[PDB]
Amino acid sequence: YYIGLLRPKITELTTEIERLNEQEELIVKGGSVLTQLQQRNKALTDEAAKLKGTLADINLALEKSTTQDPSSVKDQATKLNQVNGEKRKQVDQLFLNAKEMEALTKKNTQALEEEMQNLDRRILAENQDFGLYKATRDEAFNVSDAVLSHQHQIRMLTAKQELLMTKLSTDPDKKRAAEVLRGILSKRQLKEELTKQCALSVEEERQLLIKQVKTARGDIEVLERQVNETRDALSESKNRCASLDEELKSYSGDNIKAFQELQEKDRELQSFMDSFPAKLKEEMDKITEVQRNIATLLERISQALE
Amino acid sequence: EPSEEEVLQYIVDNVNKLLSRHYSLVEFDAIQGTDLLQILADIFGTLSPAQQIDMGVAPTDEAAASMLEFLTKTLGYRVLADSFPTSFSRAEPTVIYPTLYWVLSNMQQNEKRVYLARFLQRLEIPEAMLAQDEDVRALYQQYVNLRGMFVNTHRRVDALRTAHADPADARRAVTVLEEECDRLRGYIQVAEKKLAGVPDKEALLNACKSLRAALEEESRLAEKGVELQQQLISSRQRSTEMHNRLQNLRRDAADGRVDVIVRRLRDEIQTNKMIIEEQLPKELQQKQRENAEFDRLISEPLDMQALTTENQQLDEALKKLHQQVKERQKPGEDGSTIATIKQQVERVAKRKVEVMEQLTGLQADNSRTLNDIRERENRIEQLREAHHMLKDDDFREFSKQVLAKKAATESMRTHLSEQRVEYGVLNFTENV
Incomplete structure (x- = not known):
């Protein structure tokens, strides 16, 4: 009464076992199929590129066949190849210059980071709200970086667009x-x-415009404060610049050689000093030798008498 | 928490999706009574065929209880313990909608749950007959170690079936590429068929192949050149910015006053925030689009008729919009135009642009002068390295030191002279 119950459950269970193992085999076969299709896809992309290439080659030939012959075309080509070689050199010079400039900016930025560290240690010691300074400073730097990034991107876009424009001046x-x-x-x-x-409804438009004039007037206020602050910094910079180039007045012309000549006189005198002591000891010992020979003459004459 | 609005929307959407029906919200809200029971019944009929019921002709109380046992025990949801089966017997939306929500949310778990319920359980037989004849006891040992096989291979199969991805999109891409290649080879057949009657064939094609490669290297060099030039300019600018930051650091170090520093910082933060919120992203976007549209103009061939039609269409549309904005300036009930505030905003706008450009001009001269300060700082450092000049009171002390050296050597000189004169008087004492 229960064995006729075991039998069907057992066969149904084994049937699902068979299904699960067939699905396992299917998953493995699909895995190897996927690994094969990745390689096939890469190969096909590359062959497609090459096929596009020879298509373009033939179509350029169709264009140039009416007006040019193989000779002139290959001449145009080697001419352009020589130009491209010189251009390759120009561009590598640009690569180098830019790499230098970037390296300089990295050193300037490391420099500034050091002076920031010493000042922020100074205010932290003075027990002011350092967290607020660091926070508003990080925000200021991030928005500034943001502006520099956008301006970079626009300059870039505009220059490349100039390239596009020159290309479109062909036709x-x-x-x-x-x-x-x-x-x-x-x-x-x-x-x-x-x-x-x-x-928008004209009432909504006037509401928006009224809010706009409010915020614009507030912006104008903060702008006028900035204008005064940078006039102050600008005055400061101009005084630093005149201060520096007068500091530079003191190295020009004769002054540098005058110090060079005093240096040379120093080195002469020190050489002469270093020449003094050994010769002093030598002459000392010579004088002691001649006084010893005084004694020799005297006592030898005395010994002659005995 | 979801409003009954959001709940009804979810229920209708997923009931429509699972049963492929197109109920509207009113129409579904209209489904109370046994019909709503059969809605839930058909949800469960997508999960287990055994649950497929006709509620139209069925003992509603016993079938509703059967449903409840299904939803509670196999699917696994419970709550109001005394009222739940009585009110669930009723087609009470206040109890049914949360159940529909729960089932239509966890639908995948319902699938897995019913799979296990079909396979794992429903044996608790006492061992009496099992201890009577060992034959069916070994049959049951077969059953239980079959269930062990089943859990082993099932967790292994499920983990590996989730681990390996579906190659459907991959085979689609591969077949698209094969078709693309076949189209290209056909295009090339057409091309080399059109190029058959050329005077010199492989000569011209090799010449053009070389010219083309020359042209592509030309254009790539042009672009990399432009890129390197601009990237230079920008790295320079970042240096200039670093110098501006340095100037501001020394000025801010002047007033140890954190508060005033933060006030001026915030004023410049929002002056930058002025151009970074819309004006620069708009200029950026417009340039990005202009360049994209010219790239697409050069990549494809031109049907100037399409763009000339877009031109005339825009001309007419802007005519409509200008007349409409004009008639928006018609005096209202007061006699007051919108244009009065338009002139106020124009006037303030000109003020802001004027002050803002004054600001930037000043900022330009600061950065310029500030570069020059670095130039001079650098050559002064180059000189202080190439030499080691003093030109100060240090110069006077150095000069006094050298004068003292001269006097000291003369002193040593007379020292040796005196020693030598005593040597001479000794030589003359010897002469006697």
Whole structure:
């Protein structure tokens, strides 16, 4: 009454065992398939690149076939190759210069970090709120870094765009098309702005504009404080600059050689001093020898008498 | 905590997804009574076929109790102990919606739970007949070590099945690439078929292959050059900034006053925050887009008709928007235009731009002068290294020291002279 109950549960359980092990085998086979497909995908990407290449080669040939012959084309090519070699040199010089500049900025920044450490130790010793100084300072530096980052990115974009513009001056058709697309971009931006404007109720617009003039007036206040603070720093810097170049007045021209000559006179005298002592001892011992010979003459004559 | 609004939205969405129905919120809210019971019943009929019930014709009390035992015991949810089965017998939304929410949330656990419930349990037989005949006792030993096999291979299979990823997207990418290659080889067949009748064939193609490689290296060198130039400029600028920071560090060290330092810091923080909040990200974005649109203009061929149509369309649309903003400036009920505040904001805006550019001009001259200070500091350090000049009261002390050296040598000189004159008088004493 229970054995006829064991039998079906046992076969059902074993059937799911079989299913689980078949799924295990499937997972392993799928794993090896995935490892194979990764290699196949890399190989196909590279072959696709090469295929695009020879396609481009043939299409350039189709272009140049009407107006040029293999000779002139290869001449254009070697000409451009020689230019690219010189350009390679220019660009490597730029690489080096920039690497130097960056190294200098790293040293300037390490320098500044040292003077920060000594000042912040100074105020921490004076038992002021150091946490607030470090906090507002970190925020100030981060926003500044942010501004420098954005300005960098814009300069970059604009320069590369100048490259794009020069490329588009090849075809007069795409040159006029590029300037028209420039206009399209500007019009897109203006539409965006005007549509933002007209999508609010004139009462909501006046509320927003009133808030805007409030915040603008507050900004103008903080701006005028900054203008005065930098006029102060600017005055300070100009006095430091005149102070320094007059400190520089004292090294120009004859002054440097005058000190050089006094140095040389020092070294002469010290050489002569170092020459003194050994010769002094030598002459001393010579004089003692001649007085000893005085004694020799005297006592030898005395011994002659006996 | 979710409002009954959010709960109803979740219930309707996931009931629609699981049962592929398209109930609207009203329509689902309209489902009370046995029909709501059968909603939950069909949820459980997606989990276990045994649970598929018709509530339309079934003993609602006994079936609702059967459901409750299913939801409590196998799925594992419990709560109001005395009222729960009585009110769950009723199609009480105040009890049903939280249950629908719980089941539609933990749906994956319900799947796993019903799988184990089908396989693991429902034996607690006493050993009496098991101790009577050892034959079925060994059959039961077979059953229990089969269950041991089952848990071993199941945890192993589940851990490895989650460990290895699905190669569906990978085979899709691989087949797309194969089709792409086949299309390219066809394109190339067309190309080399069009290039068959050329005068010199491999000559021209090798020449052009070389020219093309020359052009690509040309353009890459141009771009890396531009990149290196700008990256220089920017590293320079960061140095100038470092100098500005140094100036501010010495000025702030002047007033040990942390508070005033923080006040001026905050004033510059928000002056930067002025341009970093919108104006610079907007200029950045516009340049990024302008460059992207020109890259796409050079990569593809041009159908200037499409852009000329975008031009005329934008012309007309801006005409609409200008007339609309103009009629927004029509005097209202007071006689007051919006333009009055428009002129106030224009006037304040010109003031802010004027002061802000004054600020930046000053800041430029500070950075310039400040670079020059570093230039002069550097050459003065180069001279103080190349030499070791004094030119101070140190110069006078050095000069006094050298004069003393001269006098000292003369003194030593007369010392040796006196010693020598005594040597001479000894030589003459010897002469006698």
